[PDB]
Amino acid sequence: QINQVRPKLPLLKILHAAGAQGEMFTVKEVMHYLGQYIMVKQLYDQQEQHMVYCGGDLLGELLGRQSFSVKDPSPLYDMLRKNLVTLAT
Ligand SMILES: COc1cccc([C@@H]2N=C(c3ccc(OC)cc3OC(C)C)N(C(=O)N3CCNC(=O)C3)[C@@H]2c2ccc(Cl)cc2)c1
């Protein structure tokens, strides 16, 4: 209810697969369900949780690659800006 916008359609399918329902979502509203999705699907390595391997996911089939490290916010913001539709650049 923060006058927020809609994400990319495969992101909305990943949110539905997490058990959610929606149209408009913030990065925080996405993340609540995306952390839950990655945990229930196990899209991470138990020993290196600082990486997620979405290149094998719908996020990967959309972007051609979506495997990344969570410790590096700059390339992560560049990916987010393509998967959650917004301003910038
Ligand atoms: C700005 O938007 C973000 C984008 C990417 C990452 C983050 C955040 N970084 C981590 C996280 C960080 C470190 C880590 O391990 C060292 C594990 C993490 O969780 C993933 C494995 C799900 N995320 C988590 O969900 N967490 C971190 C906090 N505690 C948890 O149990 C789960 C967030 C996340 C992950 C993926 C997405 Cl698509 C969205 C949100 C925010």
Side-chain angles (χ1 to χ4, degrees):
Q1 299 183 358
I2 327 91
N3 195 19
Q4 76 278 40
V5 295
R6 302 204 295 163
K8 190 141 288 173
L9 300 180
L11 203 79
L12 196 153
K13 265 62 281 294
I14 294 163
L15 293 163
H16 287 189
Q21 187 283 326
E23 282 294 327
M24 296 151 285
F25 299 83
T26 66
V27 117
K28 189 65 172 182
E29 291 179 304
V30 172
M31 157 170 351
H32 177 79
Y33 293 114
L34 257 290
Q36 173 65 97
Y37 174 86
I38 287 157
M39 291 299 94
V40 74
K41 303 321 192 77
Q42 302 87 51
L43 196 50
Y44 69 98
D45 191 310
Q46 70 268 270
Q47 93 205 272
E48 289 200 84
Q49 304 173 23
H50 52 251
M51 277 200 73
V52 192
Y53 303 96
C54 310
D57 191 81
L58 292 178
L59 211 68
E61 95 88 62
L62 167 64
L63 219 298
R65 72 308 188 170
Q66 251 272 9
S67 309
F68 75 106
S69 190
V70 214
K71 73 196 176 179
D72 197 2
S74 298
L76 167 59
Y77 184 81
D78 193 74
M79 294 192 313
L80 286 169
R81 193 262 171 279
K82 300 293 183 177
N83 282 101
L84 202 179
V85 184
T86 204
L87 302 325
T89 73

